[PDB]
Design a protein around this motif. Structure first.
Motif, short mmCIF file in Angstrom:
data_model
loop_
_atom_site.label_atom_id
_atom_site.label_comp_id
_atom_site.label_asym_id
_atom_site.label_seq_id
_atom_site.Cartn_x
_atom_site.Cartn_y
_atom_site.Cartn_z
N UNK A 171 0.82 -1.24 0.00
CA UNK A 171 0.00 0.00 0.00
C UNK A 171 0.84 1.28 0.00
N UNK A 172 1.25 1.72 1.19
CA UNK A 172 2.28 2.75 1.35
C UNK A 172 3.57 2.26 0.67
N UNK A 173 3.71 0.94 0.60
CA UNK A 173 4.82 0.28 -0.08
C UNK A 173 4.85 0.54 -1.58
N UNK A 174 3.66 0.70 -2.17
CA UNK A 174 3.53 0.98 -3.59
C UNK A 174 4.12 2.36 -3.97
N UNK A 175 3.92 3.35 -3.11
CA UNK A 175 4.49 4.70 -3.31
C UNK A 175 6.01 4.67 -3.28
N UNK A 176 6.55 3.84 -2.39
CA UNK A 176 7.99 3.68 -2.27
C UNK A 176 8.51 3.07 -3.56
N UNK A 177 7.91 1.94 -3.95
CA UNK A 177 8.26 1.22 -5.17
C UNK A 177 8.32 2.13 -6.40
N UNK A 185 14.48 -12.06 -5.80
CA UNK A 185 14.16 -12.24 -7.21
C UNK A 185 13.93 -13.73 -7.49
N UNK A 186 12.67 -14.14 -7.55
CA UNK A 186 12.34 -15.55 -7.83
C UNK A 186 12.14 -15.88 -9.31
N UNK A 187 12.55 -14.94 -10.17
CA UNK A 187 12.81 -15.22 -11.58
C UNK A 187 14.31 -15.03 -11.75
N UNK A 188 14.80 -15.11 -12.98
CA UNK A 188 16.20 -14.76 -13.23
C UNK A 188 16.25 -13.37 -13.86
N UNK A 189 15.57 -12.45 -13.19
CA UNK A 189 15.18 -11.16 -13.74
C UNK A 189 16.27 -10.07 -13.69
N UNK A 190 17.21 -10.20 -12.76
CA UNK A 190 18.19 -9.14 -12.43
C UNK A 190 17.53 -7.88 -11.84
N UNK A 225 13.79 -6.75 -8.94
CA UNK A 225 12.59 -7.22 -8.22
C UNK A 225 11.33 -6.46 -8.63
N UNK A 226 10.23 -7.20 -8.74
CA UNK A 226 8.92 -6.61 -8.98
C UNK A 226 8.33 -6.16 -7.65
N UNK A 227 7.12 -5.60 -7.66
CA UNK A 227 6.52 -5.06 -6.44
C UNK A 227 6.29 -6.09 -5.35
N UNK A 228 5.83 -7.29 -5.73
CA UNK A 228 5.56 -8.37 -4.79
C UNK A 228 6.82 -8.76 -4.04
#
Ligand code: NA
Ligand code: NA
Ligand SMILES: [Zn+2]
Ligand SMILES: [Zn+2]
Ligand SMILES: [Zn+2]
Ligand SMILES: [Zn+2]
Ligand SMILES: [Zn+2]
Ligand SMILES: [Zn+2]
Ligand SMILES: [Zn+2]
Ligand SMILES: [Zn+2]
Lengths: 166, 166
Positions: free
Chosen positions: A1-7, A48-53, A55-58
């Motif tokens: 939530x407030x985390x989304x603004x940070x992201x 990072x639970x993909x090999x993404x290099x 991180x997504x929001x989750x």
């Protein structure tokens, strides 16, 4: 939530994925120098639970928790509240984690972890140091089969031990 | 002499000192990808007898010898003359150096040293690998006091062992 603004503040190219460089620039180590890139790399690869290099929001809600938790520990043990951790406080912090290590050995730890070159360890260096120690302990533990803090290994098991660090 | 012409070709900013980037760009690894920067770093720190972050002409005659010698070894053991070194040839090369290591263990060595990700080791990766092995052996040797290829160490001597690698 407030985390989304940070992201959204941290995700500067608005890609939906926070890269190494992005996370780095959103973190301070309390010394007005860039946050340890290795530390950033470790935190990324951790969540990072993909090999993404990145991180997504989750995944990022994990990171945010991890960093805040590491901040609690660091502030607890930096009791002269300078921003650095010294020999005595490092001894305290690792003693709190359950490490039983000799006073002089903390000389080596400080020499090895402190990028600033000032006999003390910053927040970013402190996380990496602890991470590196968990790893060395995990490995050791695989080889200390009777759990008495001793290992006998041959040359080849040693090489493969050192190589399983990576 | 002829070495001076080489030095002048490699020293592109004509500073009188060959930097990491400069040495890197004057070396090929036989795969049309940049020469391993870590390998370059090691060769520099080896011959740089100041804290210069580069080599002058005197020091460079050492480097030139070192690289040529490493080329002899590499070409000797890459006998199918492909440009890479494979499991069997790596087994040969290290056997020639006096290492007595199990066939399967060379799986780990290849996985650990090969940046190309192709089951074989290039010239640049090959030098670093050997260098890393000399180092691990030097350390081991400090701890194998009766010279029978075995060590018993405690947790703390282990940590300080792993930390003396660096
Ligand atoms: Na044991
Ligand atoms: Na021994
Ligand atoms: Zn982004
Ligand atoms: Zn402090
Ligand atoms: Zn202090
Ligand atoms: Zn035991
Ligand atoms: Zn130069
Ligand atoms: Zn070959
Ligand atoms: Zn081959
Ligand atoms: Zn013995």
């Amino acid at each position: 939530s407030f985390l989304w603004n940070v992201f959204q503040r941290v995700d500067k190219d608005r890609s939906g994925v926070i890269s190494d460089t992005e996370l780095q620039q959103a973190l301070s180590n309390g010394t007005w120098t860039p946050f340890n890139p290795v530390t950033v790399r470790s935190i990324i690869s951790m969540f990072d639970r993909e090999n993404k290099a990145g991180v997504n929001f989750s995944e990022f809600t994990g990171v945010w928790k991890y960093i805040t938790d590491w901040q609690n520990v660091f502030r607890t043990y930096d009791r002269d509240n300078s921003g650095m951790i010294d020999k005595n406080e490092l001894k305290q912090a690792l003693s709190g984690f359950g490490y039983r290590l000799s006073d002089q050995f903390h000389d080596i730890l400080i020499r090895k972890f402190d990028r600033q070159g000032r006999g003390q360890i910053a927040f970013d260096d402190f996380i990496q140091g602890c991470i590196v120690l968990q790893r060395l302990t995990d490995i050791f533990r695989r080889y200390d089969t009777d759990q008495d803090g001793w290992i006998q290994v041959s040359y080849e098991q040693y090489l493969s031990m050192v190589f399983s660090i990576v």
